Amino acid sequence: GEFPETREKMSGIRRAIAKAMVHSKHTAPHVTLMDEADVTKLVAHRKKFKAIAAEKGIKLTFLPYVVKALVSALREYPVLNTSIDDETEEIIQKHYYNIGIAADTDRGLLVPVIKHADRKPIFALAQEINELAEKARDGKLTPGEMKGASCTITNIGSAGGQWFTPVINHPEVAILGIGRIAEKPIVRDGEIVAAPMLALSLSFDHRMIDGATAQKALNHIKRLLSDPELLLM
Amino acid sequence: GEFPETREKMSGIRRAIAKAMVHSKHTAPHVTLMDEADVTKLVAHRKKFKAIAAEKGIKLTFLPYVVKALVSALREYPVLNTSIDDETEEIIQKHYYNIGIAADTDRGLLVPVIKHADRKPIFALAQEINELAEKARDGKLTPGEMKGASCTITNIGSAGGQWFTPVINHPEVAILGIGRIAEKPIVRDGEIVAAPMLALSLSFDHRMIDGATAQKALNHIKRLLSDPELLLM
Amino acid sequence: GEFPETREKMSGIRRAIAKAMVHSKHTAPHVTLMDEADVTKLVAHRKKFKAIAAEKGIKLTFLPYVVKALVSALREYPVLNTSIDDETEEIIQKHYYNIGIAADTDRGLLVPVIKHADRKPIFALAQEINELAEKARDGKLTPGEMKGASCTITNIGSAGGQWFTPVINHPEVAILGIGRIAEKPIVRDGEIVAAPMLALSLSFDHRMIDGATAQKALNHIKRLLSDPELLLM
Amino acid sequence: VTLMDEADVTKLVAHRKKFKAIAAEKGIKLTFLPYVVKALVSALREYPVLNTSIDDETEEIIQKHYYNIGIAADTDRGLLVPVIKHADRKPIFALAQEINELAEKARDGKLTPGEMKGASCTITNIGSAGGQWFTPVINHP
């Protein structure tokens, strides 16, 4: 009659999503670190190879560089490859680099995993990433492709946004959020110049990783993204 | 004798506040999106009509524009008008636009609600907002005026501040926080210029609204606040 | 054979850390305020007295100024000196200024406390801070030196970083996080200039301290850090 | 059959130079060989016949599906060929480090016999002694 409302049932998809979210919410205290990287060289580098990738049928995005930077951080700061179950003798350290890429789809939140990301080049990752993204979009993923990540990267940047506070998928200890790239005035040396900056948000499980360690891992990533040639070698 | 301490009882007001806060804290995983809007045109527009409002006995603030921008987002992204109770057949979608305005008072946190905000002009909202604010300040609100919101806006900006992390009032799915407006160097086109920026913080319930959707809703709001004429039409 | 994993026991140190963290995570809804202070004068002031401190065997850092600014805020906004236990007649107001300084060590998170911080000068604090830091690093702290804080300051800035989201040590109502200092373009008066900015992150317990109060306390701190002479007098 | 040819390496020289200091800080000596190793892996992948081997019986055409590259060295013990296994999964700095370690092991006779086996292809450097266009003997397998 007035202030109309429509009632709907949670059982179709919402209940399934909530069942997982209601566990993640009290898994651990979570801490997020908000920071920014200067990506001037990254932008220039990706641009330089954009045409080449196109000739090969590969679309470059910045994500493949982020994936490589994360693998490097995971190697330097090995605590990030750990996972924790609830029993006492359950601290697990992985010795491989499997990186999940989150995607928001009509089926909820899916996370395809690139296994052995440590052994792939940038063009190969770009191709695998694009293929997994399409499979996720259409619901064509094999369940075994959504398992085994040591860490996950969540892109919000494709929708715009900065500094969000991603939820750590509960079996892991950290998730890296990626925001948009946009020019901002920065001070470089003695001058105020504009340069593209990438908003980063790192979320970690406080029960295992402390503040200084997480920030150091983030600093590692920031340094590599700002200079792709060192990242590649 | 030394390191003196005074003991007081929680039962006067603190217990009542805590009773509500201790439920909200574990209602859902919450995600906040921190971002900024260029409000150069908004500032100029409000200024232009400041004298007119004064003649009519109306004080303009930026909030009436925020309220209109939120209504527009609520309409474009209808998931934001939903609410969830704990039983399975409890997903409720509202078909009206009732917006709560939070206020910090000596009686705790009050939220007067502007009903049918979708049918009001800017001057009318400014007048209603100011009246509700006074009623809240003095404790003169009728309980029915604090009910029925589809969404709430929390201003911290009147006290200064940026990017806070508002608590979603548990019956709803999102809350919009508003920070201060201040000039910052920005890069506009090819030049570094200063312009007033509004700090925004959007908090949403992860069990229903995903990252991309919340950011899109926020982008909608940012676009409208940056250009009030489109917002009005 | 493939995707190797190593299992380890949580009982050495991790269980102890988790036992505390798993309580703090659901103690209260926590709200963080992210903001920035212009510290141009602070930097210049510390520099001016750097040589003097060195002659006396004292290393100056910015922390002693932060400690004084916090004491001042604690005095102006006395709610910050409170603590809460879980029984009803447990609202405790302290009438002293004991400030904890957090440190990330190989023994987990330690918090030495400077008692009666309100009666110490900057050089004295710098000396006490450095001594406590060394004792914490080596595990030489007396347990009574880790007790009695009214508030805690957490530095992440020594590792780089901005805007983190510190966990309030559960017995208290607020924690102040300190990020790095770095120059950023700012607009000052009518010009775009660069100046060192300090990233601040204030985290508070929503059951006792509201948004406006916490922001006002933060504004107090920001004003004092931007002008050390007023802070000293 | 030998094919004698020449490559313009202006960019290669400039690139190695750029990262020389970095490698030194990490305890890594860069030479051009790590780039040659990567270029060879790429060729082996594009032209897979190069990963084959042949034994003398008829049903002995073997195609490898991995990239193990031998690096020949002339030592006082004769010609040794340490093998970098899974060269396809290593970065330049890592190869430079492995190459230098294998070279030292070969020089001192400290190689484990299993480190001299499994190559799909071998690279022979004569360049360290000067020289152009030599006619290397294909290790028969």
Numbering used by the authors:
A (entry chain A), B (entry chain A), C (entry chain A): 1 to 233
D (entry chain A): 31 to 171
What do the paper's sentences say?
The HIV-1 envelope glycoprotein (Env) mediates cell entry and is the target of the host humoral immune response. Functional Env is a trimer of noncovalent gp120-gp41 heterodimers, which are generated from the proteolytic cleavage of a gp160 precursor. Single-component, self-assembling protein nanoparticles (1c-SApNP) can display 8 or 20 native-like Env trimers as vaccine candidates.
Briefly, E2p forms a protein shell of 23.2 nm with a distance of 12.8 nm across the hollow interior measured at the inward-facing tip (G382). A 3-aa “ASG” linker, with “AS” resulting from the restriction site between the Env and NP genes, enabled the proper display of Env trimers on FR and E2p. To overcome this problem, we applied a previously developed data processing method, in which two flexibly linked entities (i.e., the protein NP scaffold and Env trimer here) are analyzed independently. Although additional density at the core of the NP and along the five-fold axes was observed in the EM map, attempts to resolve their structures were unsuccessful.
